[PDB]
Amino acid sequence: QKSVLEQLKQVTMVVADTGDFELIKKYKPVDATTNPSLILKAVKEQKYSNLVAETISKVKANNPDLNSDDLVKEIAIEILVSFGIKILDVIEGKVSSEVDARVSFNSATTIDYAKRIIARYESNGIPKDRVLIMIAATWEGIKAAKLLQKEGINCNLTLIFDKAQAKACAEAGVYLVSPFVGRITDWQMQQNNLKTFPAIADDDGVNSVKAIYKLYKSHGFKTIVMGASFRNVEQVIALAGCDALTISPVLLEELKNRDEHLEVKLTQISEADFRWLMNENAMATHKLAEGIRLFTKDTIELENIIKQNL
Template sequence: MNKLEQLKKMTKVVADTGDFAQIEQYQPVDATTNPSLLLNAAKMSEYAYVIDKALAKSKHLSGRLRVEEAMLDLAVGFGVEILKIIPGRISTEVDARLSFDKEATIEYAQKLVAKYAEYGIDKSRVLIKVASTWEGIKAAEVLEQKGINCNLTLMFNIVQAIACAQAKVFLISPFVGRITDWYMKEQATVNFPDVSEDNGVLSVKEIYKHYKLHGYKTIIMGASFRHIAQVEALAGCDALTIAPSLLQQLQQDNGELIRHLSPVELAKESDYKISEGDFRWMMNESPMATEKLAEGIRKFAIDTVKLEKLIENKLGL
């Protein structure tokens, strides 16, 4: 077996792309999208029909209202097409500009689920992606209680992970590569660290160990990889969302893949609950987590605006 086949036997493999052809090629269980991936896919001529279909659904509206509705339809439209290829779930992201608004996040998530329902797709096949801000986590807690499962993204600190687990969030996406990026910039180096010293890899391992020790049910899905060694170092994690270029490298490598993460003996779940004050203080104490969370939200918001401009141009607005 090649390394991709080996990895699939110990970890749920998720495709980190909006490109249908690449998803079909690597046959993941689930897939994730975000504004940046959707923007790239929307620029590809072969997916123009998805945009056209999304725009047609909102033709009864005009101006800004139509753009807002078309953005929802476009995100769901790509998700619907991807669900035709994969057997599992699609992660669809809430507008990053709502990352600090609990109620607006809940409302946006419910709109996404309703639009999937219009295509006959049950909410059990959808994960709502939300940034791991305090407000995002609290919104996800409410959504989970409503039976809407969530994927908490842009995670850089274990306090975010613990708060998500205590909120009974379905899945978290701790970012590996962006943590690595921060420390490489801080240390003024262009060379990737050995995975045994890679802060991004170590962060996911810390979260994994904590979750398994305390019996948390929330799924850990490592994300944002810069090179193949980072993926291999987390073999055995509950799930990993991997870009097509790295999936290809795994598929072409017939070497042995060693499992590095396995469930450990459970301890009693801690009675200690993360408060908002705890959360904000621990984030404040980590310049890396504070900066990367803010930067991630800004970048997704920028690409969301670009996607809106693309739609406005299509509509001649």
């Protein structure tokens, strides 16, 4: 009698959503993802302070020409990479590293940031095939990802809240999309001051991923659909069969400790078109923007921590 976690792995690529590599080992996910909030958490909790201190010393040594601001930016990238490297030691698949959320509306600076991350991984002996560059799915992010994919850099288009938005990502040939589930359900609950989670059939977040999956499979899009942002284990279970699901260590532990039967449930857009379709979706418009704001705040806090340790 396999746990729900082991049953899930039979039909879905399980991915760990964390920067805490020591936790990853015990769940044996295929891939791992680290957003700016998770990098911040890992750095703040100080489980890896030596790794951080060493990263700061290394970057200073190799960059005697950089001023304070430029140096901090280079250290921030090296920290993302350092965590990714430690994760890659304990998984067989890929790790996702996110570009600075502040470049979300600039395709050119997104491209350059993505390339810098990739170059730092390569300088450290990690080939680009083991990495996904995570980019917020604004029109600018998708356009950047289109170019990056053409140049062999696989991308993880995140902060996906609308089906049309997911369709445009697939049209750009992106490797993977991360449709959010929990934040969509959060909007749904706040709309009507719901205190309890909706029934699964009525969960807007779960339904959004189901609709994206259905679209991708019927249209033959090869982009991987990876559900992300979970509020509870029931939302993860509801998406069993999805191509991939990125899950927090807490929820992975919950899945590992449950042993009931797991029902397997899942088995040409122009810029103007894209902007129109996103505008029609109040939730998506708000949540994409909020996501970028929140990740920005966490990136700024990480910068502040770096600055205090120079």
